[PDB]
Amino acid sequence: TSAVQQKLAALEKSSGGRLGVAAIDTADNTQVLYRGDERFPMCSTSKVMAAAAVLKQSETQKQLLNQPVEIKPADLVNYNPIAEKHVNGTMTLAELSAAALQYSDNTAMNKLIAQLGGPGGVTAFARAIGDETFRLDRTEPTLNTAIPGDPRDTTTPRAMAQTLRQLTLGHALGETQRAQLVTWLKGNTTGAASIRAGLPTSWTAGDKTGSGDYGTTNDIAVIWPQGRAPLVLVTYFTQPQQNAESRRDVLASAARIIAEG
């Protein structure tokens, strides 16, 4: 066990839950893993794969992001901070991608899934970029059940870290699309208490959070330190009690341990 792994194991022990971490240092492609091959519920971190899949489509469909999409009453689910502002109006796929990514809007996610022809369309994009691990099975809000041992709507930290790297730094997308995704992640509003809270303040980051039942608390990020090659960090966390509170502090502390090690 490495010194970082010992600190992560100690953090996990202190927490009562199950922690998964994958970090990639793009300098020497060094990676640090903790439970890196275990499945975790993705919850809203799956919105990155759905938005990226739509971005991939827009590479050949040049007008796709400006395409208006109707928001109807029946579309509303459990958490719709942006979509509920536009009921009986429209939102563009760009606006829906932004809402999904920067506000974790679940109605917006469902519109991306529908654009892609169902959850199978999101999973197919994962496979098309070499991710054999990601699986999206359900729409919002049922994808957040986060039931212990259920493989539905899960991935591993190792897989999501590699995917996130390919999407935001490594040309799985076109350049206009990659920059748009980087811009979206940087502008996230839901991440201040998660990975970002554990990083040196001179570092810049983009991220996508997730949360669900079993106190599931997740964050995935791409990170730019100054005069150092960028990093990719995934932190997944879930707990034994179905009704457990969120533990964003665990993700912040994991990021601190990675940043230092």
Q: Can you tell me the distance from the alpha carbon of 230 to that of 167, in angstroms, rounded to the nearest whole number?
A: 14
**Closest separation between CB of residue 185 and K ion, Å?**
9
CB of 97 to K ion, least distance (A): 12
If the CB atoms of residues 79 and 214 are measured against K ion, the closer one turns out to be: 79
The DSSP bridge partners found for residue 219 are 209, 235
Task: State the DSSP string of the chain.
Answer: --HHHHHHHHHHHHHTSEEEEEEEETTTTEEEEESTTS-EE-GGGGHHHHHHHHHHHHTT-TTGGG-EEEE-GGG--S--TTGGGSTTEEEEHHHHHHHHHHH--HHHHHHHHHHTTSHHHHHHHHHHTT-SS------TTGGG---TT--TTEE-HHHHHHHHHHHHTSSSS-HHHHHHHHHHHHT-SS-TTTGGGGS-TT-EEEEEEEEETTTEEEEEEEEE-TTS--EEEEEEEE-SSTTPPP-HHHHHHHHHHHHH-
Shortest reach from residue 44's CB to K ion, in Å: 4
Nearest residue to K ion on Cβ basis: 104
Binding residues for K ion, per CB under 5 A?
A: 44, 79, 104, 188, 190, 209, 246
Least separation, in Å, of the C-beta of 144 and K ion? Answer: 8
- Residues catalogued as catalytic: 44
Closest distance of CB 69 from K ion, Å: 18
